[PDB]
RNA sequence: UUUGAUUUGGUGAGAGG
DNA sequence: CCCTGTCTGGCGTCCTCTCACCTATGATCATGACGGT
DNA sequence: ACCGTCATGATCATATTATTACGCCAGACAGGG
């Protein structure tokens, strides 16, 4: 509503002011006493799902797992690897961020110690195991689920961790809703990833696939941003660079698909007739 | 069975049953009295959909009625739905040994024990009274025992303090969502008739002190007491089993 | 999803204690299913010890024992 | 000037804007909707005149006999109110009815009948209602709840987006009749249109207008234009009208009058549409590729062959063009159908259609409404005339005529009930233009489409039901019997109507029982707007927009106070001053802005004609003419605030309090409330419960006099005068001479209501507030209420209240209370409880309720009399015994010798087994009323005629004080007339008091005046004689009761509910709590002068929970208690009337421009000294909703009294005795008991008695029951490993029956062990599969 | 060849959390 | 024959508390009150 | 005051019709390019 509310509630309220305040909060008390039908039957269906899966061997002896990286979505770093990484058991040795160093063993739990010592060496990511990859026949071994949360230690045999996981995503179903280019931001090193580029006549490098990745690799090792790049977009640096906070790295156009090549020559209208295949609208307030 | 007054409040699965006996009668004395193809062709029919409306009600066209406009419950109505033997006599049942109380604050309890009034208390431990007294010798029969807890004698609260003291209780606030939802305490009887519930514990509850309402109930056997002290003791649920994050966190 | 794979299960138990009991119940029915309990529900519909908790100590011992 | 109760305590009024319409009666939709219903209308409408007008005559199936209406009249009830609620019986009035049967001839109905009769024939019971808008159905007082449903009418919906996924929106035209068949116009996303009947099978929907008797022809003649061909010599040339042509891109080049006007490959331009109707171009020239598939309009019929050349709706090609060219034809009609102007929407839906006559259509129709049977043309045209067009099946009322023509932009607002073939085809014409893009759909929730349903139309509809069911019997009996030999009433039978109005009152989902513990419960209850009940939506299904305030609630329907829970903004209440319409929509009081100044004219708006016109908002400053100070207003338009200028405006609020409800206008400082906050607060003071001695609220909004007289709870006097004799029982006024009838001498006597029973077991009194001596005005409080004092509204009680943390035990909400408050009483609730007990009738004999009883010793006899009943005031525990009833033996042993009855005693020897039926326990109380009812022929016991023996005494004394207290009147009426005209100071009283006629006193007005009131006198003789033998015998007789039951005891305890830490307070505002401990008085936190505070609040709740008014409303209280304070000073210190005149004065003027302007120099020195008894606790100040105090004006009232400016003082502490830092909020909070005790919740169980079918413990606390430990808790305990608690929670504890008799065994011998088994119920479950075809085992 | 106290079902409406 | 509107079934939160309200009938032996002798 | 006639209450099988106004969301089905 385009007229706001300019008093507070120690000036007092007149009455179309509280009337368009008891819009905004009638549709807040009807979302929330409709919300919790769907979180309680979203409970249900959850615990309902998992009912059956019991932690039942100690290892299923595998050394496959999921790749725990920190999630960046194209603002500053959103979730670190500490909050991702920690109490869960590692899928093959991590290497130290320098060469070849065995910096944790193959099979240990990720605590707060070994945490620290991940966040001073600014580890990239852990190959960790996840309880998807897990080997064993009806249940979930006790490494592959990971640390107990609300014990310090390692999950025990047998206790149900279908129940208390699907408690504990559909436990908070109340609190949820129910109803141009790349600016950086930091200091860094540019990398690319997925790309396949070339080097127009002016000198900005252009790429030749769509689904680039453009990540924003820091001075220690570690990924800090990551955007995606389109087919066909000018970007005023390059591969391995370093870059000043701020400065403006990538530029497209969306509204125009850029339909450019790789070498250079003469162009022909290769089954291009006007009358049938192109049509001719000479434009009216420019003449080109 | 008959409510009160004089008259038979009869289940909708007799008037089902009573229905498929008497066309199944006249079935039999049609074939009997040999009469034509389309008296028993109808006859037949309402037979089978007399069956089809025992066993599932309304999967056929429109289902019937007996008092007065709404549809009556069929075997397949008293296994299905919210309101079956799954969903409401099996998964979750109604529980001896139980109370239900509205909470209050008491924050001069130690976050193990939970204060408890005493009507409820010597509801709930009425076995254990029992017990406990037929030991001592004050008594001889059960009916004794039954008469003094009735009366509530002086000698009866000691005997109180005497079986409350290191058995736990499972409080529970009425919208469980998760396991901290369920936490064992022990009793600290109250003069009062409200639960007194440390405060801390709340925050795991979601539960104010607005007119809210828990229930308590007693670990009867020992394995269930052993249970509610090492593994549903409100002293080992300082973490919420979701995170890492404390759940005791001072609100 | 969620519901189609809780009510694809090998225990026809665990899928008429959820939804739909009727096509549950004809499917296992047609097909002569049997089900061996080996789960949380169908333990609590029967009346016993869970095989998670402080019975999956019982629970080895009854499948040591067969 | 003030009314004499209004000088007792004048309450201080804050407040600028001067009121101008005062709040109207409160309960005027009950009892205007119902005297509407129940009255002699004549004209037809409305009432139980319009059903017995279009039910009747019922004629005969061909017999020639015919059963007419001629009017209907009820008696009086046979039972009055008070004796109706101690039975049991309905409070209904008989309905007799004056019906006429007639029979005609043969050959000639219309001939002479042969013979009439017309007689009184009975017919159901309506239910009447009572003065305070409620009925009384079984003894307990109910209340029908007004529905808001859909408005009959056309509506013209759009099924926007979900349909088909591609975005392509429909639009559907519901025809809503008011009682008949629905009509569903719609499209489909192939463009076809498409009618349904009642959300049937589908048809394409010109199926219909050919069922109204229409050719193709004048179909398209109806639907499209013309598009005129003529072919004239050269290329078949067209006559051309441009504006057709806005946007076209033509496909050659238009020429004309030699002169190129129109490009090829161009469109045509506006200004190429001004040339050539300028130039009056007419014929213009087409190519023969125009015509490829312009679509022709009627038929062309070749002369020669006879044959069809071109059928009607078809596109016409070369060879087509080439027939009917050589045929003789130059005129071609064809249709402009265009992509955004005309679509062919009509000629597709004709394409679809299979049918081609009027016959087909109707076969069609009929195969659709009824399928799979033969058709018949006389069939079809029967079913079609009775779907639409018939006055029996089809009726809009005159508010779906209305809607119907408004919507329709029609002028006349009044037709038929049936629909017509202009109405049809306006339909689709409207539909037809929403889709073309011109015109716009109708939302649902806008209140010009809400209609609000009361209990006279409901009582109407159910009425006219149990009518169409006796007109279907009274159809078979009339025409199958002898005639003439039968009256009607041999026809018609009572049992229909009165089984219909009696589910209808009795149990329907709108009929309700009356939430009744509040005066304000009651008067916000019967004000109610529910969405629900038949006709409307469900709580479970729907949904998202009608949860929500529209922009036209305001002023209509109270945004603020509706339940939270399942069912928000269903539950609706409707505001203070919104009436109801002539038709049933909503209406709201404005006030007509002239140009320049406001009028203080009222004037009523609809919700639709609130739309069109520009209304001021309510607090917009004038200065004392009308003229708007400002130069921009805030207003609001279409739905829409904005800020226009000052002479634009066409209307202004009346006052500011008419957006809210009289639930949410009693909360002073609303306008400080978040909204969520004042919901809760609103409904919670709607939940208080009734205190001992009510007090009054200090801070008020003056609202409460209206919710306390405009109910029906206090004892309004009739008609003023002196009081004669006040009582705690009853209320003697002598009416004044100036507002007196000259007959029937009149003093008026007010029985008042002691202590009895309400619906929510709280306790109903009536107090008298007026002293001896006093004089009463018209339109005044004799008697207050239930929590009422002087004609006020006092809820809960006002304490004093410090905002501080107090050592954690005010941790969440919690509240901690001092035990002053416990010690002066004053929470101290009264309950009662009923208590019955049956003597019912089975087999060995009837029952006993005499005292000689087995089982039993003195202990429990002590406290019944010589006949089983407990007596009256016998004060007993929890597990006595008030009614001895045995017969309790069943069959413990069969009796050896068959029946053996007479041989070792006289009827038996106790049976087997006997024990007379104790009671239970958990409550205490006193029993204060025993009613005892015998069925007629059963033996009265010694004490049941004591109680008629006791009420004999007490109707005797009554009728008989009637007669002496009216005689007494009559007698002072005599000495009044001869005052004058032949007066006798000494003979007057020499003779007896019974001949005050026969003086000397001629032939006058006064001689004349005697005689008439001889005639009183000789009327109220006779009367007591005929009323007292009438008393008798209803005190005499039996009364009806159930089958088989002896006789009923019925017993009043009255509990004493004080407070204790459980129960539940809560102020005006959301703060709610559970009161958490209740200190002594020393702990309290104390001031620098010595007095405790009472209740000490939690500060935290005010920051987040925003309701920042409770702090302004402790802060105003203090000033109005430190106004109180110097009152008392200046009155116990024995002052003159001088200076407390001086400082009630100063106290009374202390403002800005206000409304209340009071001068104590008209109160004459006796009446302020009684004003300030009245004042000496404290004073009473008024704050009205929106203009309320503001802040300067609490602080400037803070400074008359001493207190410190800034509300706070410092406290000190009562454990340590040392001085809190930082000084805090003390003040008054006027705070409110709620009825969520803690000795009604609280329930515990080791082993009680179990369920039949499923052995598990019962459900609830008066079956002494269990708490479910349901699924989710079996979840959580699957989450930990506890696996023995969980089985011993579903099997031993709950259900297996050896199991837990092993477990009982073992706990009372000391072994913690259990032997688990098998839930019962899983053997329930194996039955129930097992008794299908299905084969459920246990293997191994 | 004689020991026993035992059982209160669907439907619909409304409130608390 | 592979897309496709269209129709039919199947979900829709736990725990608790208060109150009221509950199928019609169509046919006949035998008991029960009313009037004549 | 006894005998006969009209009236009125027990027990007992007989077996189903004249409203509409949720919102997805899978799953199966006749239609047609
Ligand atoms: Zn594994």
């Known amino acids: 509503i385009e007229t706001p509310i300019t008093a507070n509630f120690r000036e007092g309220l007149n009455v179309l002011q509280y ?17 919790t039908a769907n979180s309680g039957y979203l409970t249900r269906r959850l615990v309902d799902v998992a009912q059956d899966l019991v932690v039942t061997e100690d290892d299923c002896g595998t050394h496959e797992g999921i790749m725990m990286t920190p999630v960046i979505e194209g603002g500053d770093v959103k979730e670190p690897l500490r909050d991702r990484v920690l109490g869960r058991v590692t899928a093959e040795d991590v290497l130290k961020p320098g060469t070849a160093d065995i910096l944790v063993p193959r099979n240990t739990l990720l605590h707060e110690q070994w945490c620290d010592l991940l966040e001073e060496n600014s580890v990239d990511a852990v190959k960790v195991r996840s309880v998807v990859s897990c080997d064993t026949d009806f249940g979930v071994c006790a490494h592959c689920y990971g640390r107990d949360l609300a014990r310090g230690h390692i999950i025990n045999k047998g206790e149900a961790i279908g129940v208390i996981a699907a408690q504990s995503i559909g436990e908070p179903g109340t609190q949820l809703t129910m109803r141009s280019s790349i600016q950086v931001k930091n200091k860094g090193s540019i990398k690319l990833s997925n790309v396949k580029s070339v080097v127009n006549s002016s000198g900005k490098l252009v790429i030749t696939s769509r689904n680039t990745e453009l990540k924003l690799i820091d001075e220690f090792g570690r990924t800090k941003e990551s955007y995606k790049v389109p087919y066909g977009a000018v970007l005023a640096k390059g591969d391995g660079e370093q870059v000043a906070g701020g400065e403006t790295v990538a530029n497209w156009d969306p509204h125009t698909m850029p339909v450019i090549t790789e070498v250079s020559g003469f162009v022909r209208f290769t089954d291009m007739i006007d009358g049938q295949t192109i049509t001719r609208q000479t434009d009216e307030l420019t003449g080109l | 069975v008959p409510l009160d007054g004089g008259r038979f409040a009869t289940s909708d699965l007799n008037d089902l049953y009573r229905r498929v006996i008497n066309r199944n009668n006249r079935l039999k004395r049609l074939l009997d009295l040999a009469a034509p193809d389309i008296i028993v062709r109808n006859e037949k029919r309402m037979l089978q959909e007399a069956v089809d409306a025992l066993l599932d009600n309304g999967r056929r066209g429109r289902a019937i009625t007996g008092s007065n406009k709404r549809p009556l419950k069929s075997l397949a109505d008293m296994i299905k739905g919210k309101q079956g033997r799954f969903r409401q006599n099996l998964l979750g049942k109604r529980v001896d040994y139980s109370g239900r109380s509205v909470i209050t604050v008491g924050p001069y309890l130690r976050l193990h ?22 030991l001592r010798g004050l008594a001889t029969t059960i009916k004794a025992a039954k008469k003094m807890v009735e009366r509530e004698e002086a000698v009866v609260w000691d005997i109180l303090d005497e079986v409350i003291r290191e058995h736990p209780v499972l409080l529970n606030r009425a919208p469980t969502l998760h396991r901290l939802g369920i936490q064992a305490f022990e009793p600290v009887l109250i003069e009062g008739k409200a639960i007194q519930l440390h405060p801390l514990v709340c925050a795991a509850y979601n539960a104010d002190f607005d007119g809210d309402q828990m229930a308590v109930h007693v670990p009867l056997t020992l394995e269930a007491q052993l249970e509610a002290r090492a593994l549903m003791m409100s002293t080992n649920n300082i973490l919420s089993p979701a995170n890492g994050e404390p759940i005791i966190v001072p609100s | 999803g969620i519901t189609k794979a809780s009510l694809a299960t090998e225990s026809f138990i665990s899928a008429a204690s959820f939804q739909e009991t009727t096509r549950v119940l004809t499917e296992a029915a ?16 029967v009346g016993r010890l869970i095989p998670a908790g402080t019975g999956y100590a019982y629970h080895q011992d009854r499948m040591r024992r067969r | 000037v003030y009314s004499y109760t209004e000088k007792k305590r004048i309450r201080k009024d804050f407040g600028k804007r001067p009121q101008v319409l005062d709040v109207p009666y409160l309960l005027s939709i009950q009892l205007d909707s119902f005297q509407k219903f129940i009255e002699q209308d004549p004209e037809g409408q409305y009432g139980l005149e319009a059903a017995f007008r279009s039910v009747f005559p019922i004629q005969s199936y061909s017999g020639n006999s015919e059963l007419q209406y001629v009017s209907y009249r009820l008696g009086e009830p046979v039972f009055d109110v008070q004796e109706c609620q101690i039975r049991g019986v309905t409070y209904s009035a008989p309905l007799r009815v004056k019906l006429r049967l007639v029979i005609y001839e043969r050959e000639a109905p219309e001939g002479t009948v042969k013979d009439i009769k017309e007689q009184e024939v009975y017919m159901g019971e309506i239910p009447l209602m009572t003065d305070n808008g409620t009925f009384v159905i079984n003894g307990t007082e109910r209340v029908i709840v007004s529905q808001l449903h859909r408005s009959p009418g056309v509506f013209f919906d759009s099924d926007k987006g979900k349909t088909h996924s591609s975005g392509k929106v429909l639009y559907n035209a519901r025809i809503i009749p008011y009682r008949g068949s629905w009509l569903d116009f719609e499209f489909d996303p192939k463009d076809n249109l498409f009618v349904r009947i009642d959300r049937r099978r589908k048809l394409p929907a010109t199926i219909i207008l050919r069922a109204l008797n229409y050719t193709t022809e004048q179909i398209l003649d109806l639907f499209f234009e013309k598009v005129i061909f003529e072919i004239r010599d050269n290329k078949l040339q067209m006559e051309l009208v441009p504006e057709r042509l806005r946007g076209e891109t033509a496909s050659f080049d238009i020429e004309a009058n030699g002169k190129v006007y129109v490009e090829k490959g161009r469109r045509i331009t506006a ?24 679509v022709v309009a009627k038929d062309y019929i070749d002369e020669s062959t006879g044959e069809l050349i071109c059928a009607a709706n078809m596109e016409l090609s070369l060879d087509l063009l080439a027939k009917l060219s050589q045929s003789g034809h130059k005129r071609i009609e064809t249709l402009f159908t265009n992509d955004l102007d005309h679509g062919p929407y009509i000629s597709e839906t004709l394409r679809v259609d299979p049918t081609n006559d009027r016959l087909s259509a109707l076969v069609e129709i009929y195969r659709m409404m009824r399928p799979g049977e033969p058709p018949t043309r006389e069939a079809a045209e029967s079913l079609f005339e009775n779907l639409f067009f018939s006055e029996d099946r089809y009726d809009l009322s005159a508010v779906g005529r209305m809607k119907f023509n408004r919507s329709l932009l029609r002028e006349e607002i009044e037709g038929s009930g049936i629909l017509s073939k202009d109405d049809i085809i306006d339909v689709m014409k409207k539909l037809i233009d929403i889709r073309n893009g011109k015109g716009e759909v109708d939302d649902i929730d806008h209140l010009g489409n809400r209609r609000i349903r009361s209990v006279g139309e409901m009582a109407e509809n159910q009425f006219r039901v149990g009518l169409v069911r006796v007109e279907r019997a009274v159809k078979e009996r009339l025409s199958l019997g002898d005639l003439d030999t039968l009256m009607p009433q041999d026809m018609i039978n009572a049992k229909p109507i009165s089984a219909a109005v009696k589910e209808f009152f009795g149990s329907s989902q709108l009929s309700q029982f009356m939430d009744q513990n509040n005066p304000l419960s009651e008067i916000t209850h019967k004000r109610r707007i529910s969405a629900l009940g038949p006709g409307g939506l469900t709580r479970e299904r729907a949904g998202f927009e009608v949860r929500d305030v529209h922009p036209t609630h305001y002023g209509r329907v109270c945004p603020i106070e509706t339940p939270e829970g399942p069912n928000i903004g269903l539950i609706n209440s409707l505001s203070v001053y919104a009436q109801t319409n002539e038709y049933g929509f909503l209406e709201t009081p404005y006030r007509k802005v002239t140009d320049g100044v406001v009028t203080d004219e009222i004037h009523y708006l609809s919700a639709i004609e609130e739309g069109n016109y520009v209304i001021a908002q309510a607090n917009s400053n004038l200065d004392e003419e009308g003229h708007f100070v400002e130069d921009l207003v805030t207003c609001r338009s279409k739905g829409e605030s904005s800020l226009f200028s000052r002479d634009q405006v066409d209307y202004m609020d009346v006052s500011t309090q008419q957006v809210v409800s009289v639930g949410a206008s009693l909360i002073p400082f609303l306008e400080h409330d978040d909204a969520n906050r004042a919901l809760m607060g609103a409904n919670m003071q709607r939940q208080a419960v009734p205190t001992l001695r009510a007090d009054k609220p200090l801070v008020g909004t003056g609202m409460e006099r209206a919710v306390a007289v405009d109910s029906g709870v206090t004892a309004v006097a009739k008609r003023g005068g002196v009081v004669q004799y006040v009582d705690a029982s009853r209320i003697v006024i002598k009416v004044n001479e100036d507002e007196m009838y000259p007959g029937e001498a009149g003093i008026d006597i007010y029985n008042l209501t002691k202590y009895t029973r309400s619906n929510q077991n709280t306790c109903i009194n009536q107090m008298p507030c007026v002293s001896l001596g006093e004089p009463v005005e018209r339109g005044d409080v004799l008697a207050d209420g239930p929590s009422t004092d002087l004609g006020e509204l006092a809820l809960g009680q006002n304490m004093r209240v ?73 004060e007993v525990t929890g597990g006595d015994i008030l009614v001895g009833k045995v017969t309790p033996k069943g069959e413990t042993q069969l009796t050896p010798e068959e029946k053996l009855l007479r041989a070792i005693f006289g009827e038996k020897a106790s049976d087997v087994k006997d024990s007379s039926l104790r009671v239970p326990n958990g409550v205490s109380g006193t029993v204060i009323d025993v009613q005892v009812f015998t069925r007629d022929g059963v033996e009265k016991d010694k004490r049941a005629l004591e109680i008629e023996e006791m009420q004999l005494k007490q109707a005797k004394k009554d009728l008989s004080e009637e007669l002496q207290i009216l005689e007494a009147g009559l007698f002072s009426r005599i000495r009044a007339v001869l005052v004058a005209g032949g007066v006798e100071a000494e003979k007057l009283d020499k003779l007896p008091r019974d001949r005050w006629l026969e003086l000397g006193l001629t032939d006058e007005e006064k001689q004349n005046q005697l005689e008439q009131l001889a005639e009183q006198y000789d009327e109220l003789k006779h009367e007591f004689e005929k009323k007292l033998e009438a008393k008798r015998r209803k005190i005499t007789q039996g009364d009806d009761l159930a089958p088989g039951v002896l006789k009923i005891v019925k017993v009043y305890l009255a509990v004493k509910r ?10 005006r505002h959301g703060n709610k709590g559970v009161i958490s401990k209740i200190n002594p008085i020393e702990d309290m936190p104390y001031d620098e002068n010595g007095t405790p505070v009472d209740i000490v609040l939690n500060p935290l ?81 008024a704050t009205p909703v929106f203009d309320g105090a503001k802040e300067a004006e609490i602080k400037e009232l803070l400074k008359l009294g001493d207190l410190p400016t800034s509300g706070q003082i410092r406290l000190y502490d009562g454990r340590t005795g040392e001085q809190f830092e930082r000084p805090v909020t003390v003040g008054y909070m006027y705070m409110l008991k709620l009825n969520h005790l803690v000795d009604d919740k609280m329930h515990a169980r080791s082993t009680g008695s179990y369920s039949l079918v499923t052995q598990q413990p019962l459900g609830g606390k008066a079956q002494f029951g269990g708490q479910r430990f349901g699924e989710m808790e079996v979840w959580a305990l699957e989450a930990y490993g506890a696996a023995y608690t969980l089985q011993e929670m579903l099997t031993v504890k709950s259900d297996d029956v050896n199991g837990r008799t092993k477990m009982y065994k073992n706990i009372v011998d000391g072994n913690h062990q259990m032997e688990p088994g ?14 299908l075809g299905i084969n459920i085992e246990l293997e191994d």
């Open chain 4, 271 to 294: 200004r190429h549409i001004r040339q050539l109707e300028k130039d009056d171009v007419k014929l213009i020239e087409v190519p023969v590729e125009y015509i490829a598939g312009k």
């Open chain 1, 19 to 35: 009337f368009i305040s008891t819009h905004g909060a009638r549709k807040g008390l009807a979302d929330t006493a409709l919300k």
């Open chain 4, 1318 to 1331: 098998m839930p019962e119920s899983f053997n329930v479950l194996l039955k129930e599969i097992r008794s």
């Open chain 4, 802 to 874: 410090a905002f501080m943390p107090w050592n954690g035990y005010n941790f969440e909400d919690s509240i901690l209370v001092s035990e002053r408050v416990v010690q002066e009483d004053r929470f101290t609730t009264i309950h009662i409880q009923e208590l019955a007990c049956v003597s019912r009738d089975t087999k060995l004999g009837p029952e006993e309720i005499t005292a000689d009883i087995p089982n039993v010793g003195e202990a429990a006899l002590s406290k019944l009399d010589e006949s089983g009943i407990v007596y009256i005031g016998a």
């Open chain 4, 1101 to 1181: 709740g005010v920051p987040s929970r925003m309701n920042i008014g409770q702090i302004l409303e402790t802060h105003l209280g203090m000033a109005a208690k430190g106004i109180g304070d110097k009152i008392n000073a200046m009155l116990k210190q024995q002052q003159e009337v001088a200076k407390l005149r001086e400082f009630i004065q100063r106290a009374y003027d202390l403002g800005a421009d206000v409304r209340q302007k009071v001068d104590l120099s008209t109160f004459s020195d006796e009446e302020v000294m009684r004003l300030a008894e009245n004042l000496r606790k404290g004073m009473p100040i």
């Open chain 2, 113 to 134: 024990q939970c204060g408890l009034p005493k009507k409820m208390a010597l509801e709930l431990f009425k076995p254990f009274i029992y017990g406990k007294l037929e």
């Open chain 4, 1058 to 1067: 004080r407070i204790q830490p459980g129960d539940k307070m809560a102020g």
């Open chain 3, 30 to 45: 047609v097909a002569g299913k049997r089900d061996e309990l080996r789960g949380l529900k169908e333990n609590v519909i």
